[PDB]
Ligand binder design. Structure first.
Ligand SMILES: [Mg+2]
Ligand SMILES: [Mg+2]
Ligand SMILES: [Mg+2]
Ligand SMILES: [Mg+2]
Ligand SMILES: [Mg+2]
Ligand SMILES: [Mg+2]
Ligand SMILES: [Mg+2]
Ligand SMILES: [Mg+2]
Ligand SMILES: [Mg+2]
Ligand SMILES: [Mg+2]
Ligand SMILES: [Mg+2]
Ligand SMILES: [Mg+2]
Ligand SMILES: [Mg+2]
Ligand SMILES: [Mg+2]
Lengths: 213, 159, 293, 176
RNA sequence: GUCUACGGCCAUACCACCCUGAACGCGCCCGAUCUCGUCUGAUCUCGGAAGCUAAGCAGGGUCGGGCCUGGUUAGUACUUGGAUGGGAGACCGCCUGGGAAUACCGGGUGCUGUAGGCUU
RNA sequence: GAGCAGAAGGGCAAAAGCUCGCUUGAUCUUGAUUUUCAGUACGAAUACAGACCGUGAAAGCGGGGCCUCACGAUCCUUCU
C-alpha cells in the first residue's frame, strides 16, 4: 500500500518534475485527460461549467482519476453517453518521495536512522492555486442542473474545498457567450473542432480574401 | 560546502545578453582611460583574458594604472569586518565609464560658471540642490463640471 | 506538409544579425580589432592606417584614424584624378596603383609641412627602401597597411600603393616577400623585374606579344590604348612623366558646384493615411468585384 | 516582340560546371585505373575523394579512397556534354531535373562516348551532373560583398527545359 | 535629392516576394601574356572596357512575418515594514510604501561622422 | 540546433570550429596583483617590464591548452 494523502497535501518541497535529474518514477495513474464526445465542434456544446478550488494544496494522480470516473458515470446516465465532454485541466508533474523502509535490524544495509535520507520517488501530484479550475464540462444549455450535480459529486474525492461555477465563456474557449454568436457572424471567430480560431484584421490581405469569399 | 572555484555561480553574470552575442562592439576598445577616473566593472564572458572576479562584478573603483591592454583599478571590497582597498588588473572590455561622476564633473564647471557671472548681473543664484520641498498652495479649477463620483464595485467570480 | 520549416516565426525571434558592414560583406572586424585599436598607455595618439581598395575601374587610397564616432580621413588619393597630368587611360593596374600611392604620400606630407624633407627616393629602384628618421627634423609619418578583404598574395595591387607610399616618403613597416619581384621557391628578391611593373613594362611587352598573335583581338583588348595613339613603346617614359607632376604639384583642388536642382530621383515613403485607405478600396473592389456572377 | 526581347544582353541560360564522378568501393587498382580514364575524355588531372565516416554494412571504412571527380568548365564542357546526351539518345526523364534547374544522368559503360578500350582499363560506368547557370550567379561565391542571386534570376525546373529543348533538342515524356 | 571609400550605434537596419532606378559610382562582365592560385582563370590573382541594369546594390511597396516603442493586461501577480488581525490549519484580509510579465490593441521601420563624386 | 580531449556551465561563425603552411612564448628573468585567505602559504591565474625568439606583408598575437579543476612544505637525496 501507500501513505494516506494527509502526508503529501501541502506544497512545501520545491516543484520537482521527472527530468534528467530524477529517474525511475512510477507512472501516473491518470492517463486519459479528455473524455466524453471529444469531436463536438462549437454549437453542439454551448454551456461551460468549471470546478475551481479554494486552497493552495497539491492534488494527487490517484485522486484525479478517481474523481474523473465518478464525474463521468453520472453524466453517462443523465444525457446519454455522448452528450457531455469533460477535460481535467491538471497534470501530475510534481513528484512525491518516500524515505526508505527499515526492516531488519540495524546492520543491513548502510543506514539505521535518518542517515542518508533523501528518499526515492513513489508518486506524482499536481499543485493547485486559489484561482484555478480543476474540471470543466461542456454540454447543452439544458443540462445545467447536471453539470453542477456531477461536479458536486466529484468534490468528495479531493481533500480541499472546491466551488462549482458556470462560466461566461462559450464552451472551452476564452470568448464570452453573448458575444460569440455574433463574432462568428462577423468572421472574427472561425471554428475548427473543440476550439476556435481568432482571425485578427492585421494579417496579409490574401488571408482575408479566402475567408471572406 | 561549495567549491572555491573562480567561476562558481557565474552562470548568468558572465553570460552575454540576449541577441547581443558574438563580436564585441569596437568603440569599447577605444574609450580612453586616464588615471584617476571612476569606472564601473561589469565583465563580459566573450573575452576570457583579464576578466575580474565575481566579487567585483557590479562594483566601482578608480584607475591608478594604465597599461597596453588592461587597467589598474582600486576597488573597495567589503570582507567580513573591514573594507579594504584591493588593486585589481582588468582588461578594458570589462569596464566602462561611470556616468555618476560625469553628471557631477559637468555641474562643478556649471556652478563655477554661474558664480563668476553672478556679479555683473548682481544676482545671488542658487547653487546647492535642495531635496524637493513640499508643494505650495494652488487652486484646482473644476472648470464647470462636477467631480465624478467613484464607487466600489460588486464582486464577480471570473477567474 | 513536407519539411518542418527552419525559417519559422521562432527563427526570426532569436535571430541575431551581425554588424552592418559585416553582413554587407565590406569589413572584417576580426582584423579591424587588431589594426586600429591604439594601446591605452598612449591615451590620445592617432594610430594611422593606410586603406587601399581596388574596385573594377578605380584605385582608392587614403589614410584614416579612428574615433568613437567614425573614422577620420586625413587625406585621400584616387585613380580617376590621374588624367590631370601625364597618363590618360590604363588605370586600376599595378602601375597606376604605384602613382596613386605616390600621390597619396606627397599630398599628405606637404599638408603637414614636410615636402622639403623625406622625399623618399626620386629615382625608381625596386629594392627595399625603408624611411629612416632624419634627426634634428620632425619625425616620419609612421603608417600601417589596411589591405581589407583582398588576399595578400605575391604581386597584389595593394602593394603597388605600399611601394608608392614608401617611395614617396612615408615610413611603413613592410617586407619584400609580397612584391612582384619576389621569387617563392629560392627565397629570392630579384628587384629588377619589380621595376618592370612600376613602369608598366609587363603590359607593354604584352602589347607586343599580341601583335603577332592576332590583329582584331589586340585592338579589342586595348581598345582605349588605340585611343590617344598609345603605342606599345614610350610607356616607360609615359609613367616617368607622371612621377614628375606628382612631386611638383600634389595639392588637391576640387571644382565646386551649387547650380543644381533638388529633384527627387526616388519615391517618397507612403504615409499612414495613404496606406489605410488603399486596403479599404482593395476590399471595395473585391466585395463589389465578385457581386456580378 | 517589344516584351519578347529584354533578356538578350544578360539573361542567357548557359552551363557552368559538368561534374564528373566515378565511384568504386575499392581503394587501389580499382580506383587508380578508374582515375586513368579521366585524363583523356577530358584532358585534365582528376582529383580523388575520400570517405567521411564508415558504414561497415558493405565493407568500407573511413579515410579510404572511394571515388574520383572532375569539374569541366568553359568551351571544353559542351563537347563532353554532347558525348553524354547522344549516349542517352537525347532522352532523359523529368525526375533527372532538380528544384534549382540542374540535370544529371548516368552511363552504364564508359567506352560508349568514349575513346578506346585500353590494355588495362576498366569496364566502368560514370555520371555527368550539369550545373546550369546564368551571367551573374558568380556573386554568391566571391569574397568581397557576396550575396544571394535574386528570385527571378534563379533557375527553375520548368525553364531548364527552355534551355535544353532549344540548344540540344532532347526530349522528355516519359516523365514518371 | 543622393552615391562610392571608410566607419560608429549593431534588425526601426533582418527575412520573404514584387515595382522602379536619370547622371556618377559600385557591379555584372571580356580575357589568361606576365603576377599568382587551382581537378577546373568558377572563386583567388592579373590585363582590360564590347555589353547591359537581368542580378547584387539603392529607393518604394505589402490590411506581410520579425524587431523597436506604446497602451491594455493592472494597481493585477508579487513584495518592504506593521498588528494580542482572521482561520483548526492551508493560507487570506487590512495598514504603510514600491510595483511587474504574455495574450489582446496601436504606431514606427534605420540614423549618422570624416573624405571625395554626380544631380544646371 | 555541430565542433572546441574530458564533468557541467559560460564563450565562439571571413571565429575559439575544420583543413593546410611555418614553427617552439610549454624558453630565460626581477617584482606587483588577483583567487582561498588570517588578507599566510601551496596550487592556479591576471596585468607589466628586461632579454631572446616564433609568426604574419603588416597591425599585431604568443611567455602552454577558449575560461572555470587536473596536485604537494621542512629535513634528506639527486641533477643543473
Ligand atoms: Mg522541505
Ligand atoms: Mg547510523
Ligand atoms: Mg552547497
Ligand atoms: Mg557543490
Ligand atoms: Mg542563481
Ligand atoms: Mg590562457
Ligand atoms: Mg586578414
Ligand atoms: Mg507588420
Ligand atoms: Mg499593498
Ligand atoms: Mg583566422
Ligand atoms: Mg616581453
Ligand atoms: Mg615580431
Ligand atoms: Mg618537492
Ligand atoms: Mg641538502
Amino acid at each position: 500500500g501507500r501513505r494516506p494523502a494527509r502526508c503529501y497535501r501541502y506544497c512545501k518541497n520545491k516543484p520537482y518534475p521527472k527530468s534528467r535529474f530524477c529517474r525511475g518514477v512510477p507512472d501516473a495513474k491518470i492517463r486519459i485527460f479528455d473524455l466524453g464526445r471529444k469531436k463536438a465542434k462549437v454549437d453542439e456544446f454551448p454551456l461551460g461549467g468549471h470546478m475551481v478550488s479554494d486552497e493552495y494544496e497539491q492534488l494527487s494522480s490517484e485522486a484525479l482519476e478517481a474523481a474523473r470516473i465518478c464525474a463521468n458515470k453520472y453524466m453517462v446516465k443523465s444525457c446519454g453517453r455522448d452528450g457531455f465532454h469533460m477535460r481535467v485541466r491538471l497534470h501530475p508533474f510534481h513528484v512525491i518521495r518516500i524515505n526508505k523502509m527499515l526492516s531488519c535490524a540495524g546492520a543491513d544495509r548502510l543506514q539505521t536512522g535518518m542517515r542518508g535520507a533523501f528518499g526515492k520517488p513513489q508518486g506524482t501530484v499536481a499543485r493547485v492555486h486559489i484561482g484555478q479550475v480543476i474540471m470543466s464540462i461542456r454540454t447543452k444549455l439544458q443540462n445545467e442542473e447536471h453539470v453542477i450535480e456531477a461536479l458536486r459529486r466529484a468534490k468528495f474525492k479531493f481533500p480541499g474545498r472546491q466551488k462549482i461555477h458556470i462560466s461566461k465563456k462559450w464552451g472551452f474557449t476564452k470568448f464570452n457567450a453573448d458575444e460569440f454568436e455574433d463574432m462568428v457572424a462577423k468572421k472574427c471567430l472561425i471554428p475548427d473542432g473543440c476550439g476556435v480560431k481568432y482571425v485578427p484584421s492585421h494579417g496579409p490581405l490574401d488571408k482575408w480574401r479566402v475567408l471572406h469569399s | 560546502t561549495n567549491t572555491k572555484g573562480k567561476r562558481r555561480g557565474t552562470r548568468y553574470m558572465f553570460s552575454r545578453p540576449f541577441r547581443k552575442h558574438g563580436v564585441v562592439p569596437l568603440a569599447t576598445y577605444m574609450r580612453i582611460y586616464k588615471k584617476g577616473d571612476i569606472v564601473d566593472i561589469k565583465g563580459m564572458g566573450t573575452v576570457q583574458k583579464g576578466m575580474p572576479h565575481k566579487c567585483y562584478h557590479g562594483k566601482t573603483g578608480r584607475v591608478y594604472n594604465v597599461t597596453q591592454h588592461a587597467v589598474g583599478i582600486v576597488v573597495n571590497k567589503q570582507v567580513k569586518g573591514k573594507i579594504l582597498a584591493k588593486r585589481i588588473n582588468v582588461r578594458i572590455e570589462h569596464i566602462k565609464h561611470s556616468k555618476s561622476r560625469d553628471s557631477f564633473l559637468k555641474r562643478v564647471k556649471e556652478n563655477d560658471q554661474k558664480k563668476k557671472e553672478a556679479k555683473e548681473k548682481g544676482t545671488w543664484v542658487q547653487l546647492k540642490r535642495q531635496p524637493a520641498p513640499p508643494r505650495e498652495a494652488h487652486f484646482v479649477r473644476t472648470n464647470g463640471k462636477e467631480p465624478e463620483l467613484l464607487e466600489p464595485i460588486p464582486y464577480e467570480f471570473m477567474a | 506538409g513536407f519539411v518542418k520549416v527552419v525559417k519559422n516565426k521562432a527563427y526570426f525571434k532569436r535571430y541575431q544579425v551581425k554588424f552592418r558592414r559585416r553582413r554587407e560583406g565590406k569589413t572584417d572586424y576580426y582584423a579591424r580589432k587588431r589594426l586600429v585599436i591604439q594601446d591605452k598607455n598612449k591615451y590620445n595618439t592617432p594610430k594611422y592606417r593606410m586603406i587601399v581598395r581596388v574596385t573594377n575601374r578605380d584605385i582608392i587610397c587614403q589614410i584614416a584614424y579612428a574615433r568613437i564616432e567614425g573614422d577620420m580621413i586625413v587625406c585621400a588619393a584616387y585613380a580617376h584624378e590621374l588624367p590631370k597630368y601625364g597618363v590618360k587611360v590604363g588605370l586600376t593596374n599595378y602601375a597606376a596603383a604605384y602613382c596613386t600611392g605616390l600621390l597619396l604620400a606627397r599630398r599628405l606630407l606637404n599638408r603637414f609641412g614636410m615636402d622639403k624633407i623625406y622625399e623618399g627616393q626620386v629615382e625608381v629602384t625596386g629594392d627595399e627602401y625603408n624611411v629612416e628618421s632624419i634627426d634634428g627634423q620632425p619625425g616620419a609619418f609612421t603608417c600601417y597597411l589596411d589591405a581589407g578583404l583582398a588576399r595578400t598574395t605575391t604581386g597584389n595591387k595593394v602593394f603597388g600603393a605600399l611601394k608608392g607610399a614608401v617611395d614617396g616618403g612615408l615610413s611603413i613597416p613592410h617586407s619584400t616577400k609580397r612584391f612582384p619581384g619576389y621569387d617563392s621557391e629560392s627565397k629570392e628578391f630579384n628587384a629588377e623585374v619589380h621595376r618592370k611593373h612600376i613602369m608598366g613594362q609587363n603590359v607593354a611587352d604584352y602589347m607586343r606579344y599580341l601583335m603577332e598573335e592576332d590583329e582584331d583581338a589586340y585592338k579589342k583588348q586595348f581598345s582605349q590604348y588605340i585611343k590617344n595613339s598609345v603605342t606599345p613603346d614610350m610607356m616607360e617614359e609615359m609613367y616617368k612623366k607622371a612621377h614628375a607632376a606628382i612631386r611638383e604639384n600634389p595639392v588637391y583642388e576640387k571644382k565646386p558646384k551649387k547650380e543644381v536642382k533638388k529633384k527627387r530621383w526616388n519615391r517618397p515613403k507612403m504615409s499612414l493615411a495613404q496606406k489605410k485607405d488603399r486596403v479599404a478600396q482593395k476590399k471595395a473592389s473585391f466585395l463589389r468585384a465578385q457581386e456580378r456572377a | 516582340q517589344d516584351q519578347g526581347e529584354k533578356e538578350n544582353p544578360m539573361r542567357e541560360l548557359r552551363i557552368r560546371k559538368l561534374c564528373l564522378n566515378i565511384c568504386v568501393g575499392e581503394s587501389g587498382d580499382r580506383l587508380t585505373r578508374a582515375a586513368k580514364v579521366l585524363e583523356q575524355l577530358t584532358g585534365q588531372t582528376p582529383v580523388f575523394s575520400k570517405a567521411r565516416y564508415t558504414v561497415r554494412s558493405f565493407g568500407i571504412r573511413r579515410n579510404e579512397k572511394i571515388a574520383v571527380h572532375c569539374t569541366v568548365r568553359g568551351a571544353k564542357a559542351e563537347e563532353i556534354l554532347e558525348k553524354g546526351l547522344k549516349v542517352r539518345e537525347y532522352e532523359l526523364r523529368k525526375n533527372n531535373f532538380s528544384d534549382t534547374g540542374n540535370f544529371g544522368f548516368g552511363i552504364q559503360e564508359h567506352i560508349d562516348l568514349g575513346i578506346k578500350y585500353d590494355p588495362s582499363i576498366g569496364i566502368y560506368g560514370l555520371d555527368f551532373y550539369v550545373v546550369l547557370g546564368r551571367p551573374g550567379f558568380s556573386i554568391a561565391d566571391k569574397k568581397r560583398r557576396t550575396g544571394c542571386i535574386g528570385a527571378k534570376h534563379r533557375i527553375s525546373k520548368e525553364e531548364a527545359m527552355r534551355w535544353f529543348q532549344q540548344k540540344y533538342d532532347g526530349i522528355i515524356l516519359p516523365g514518371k
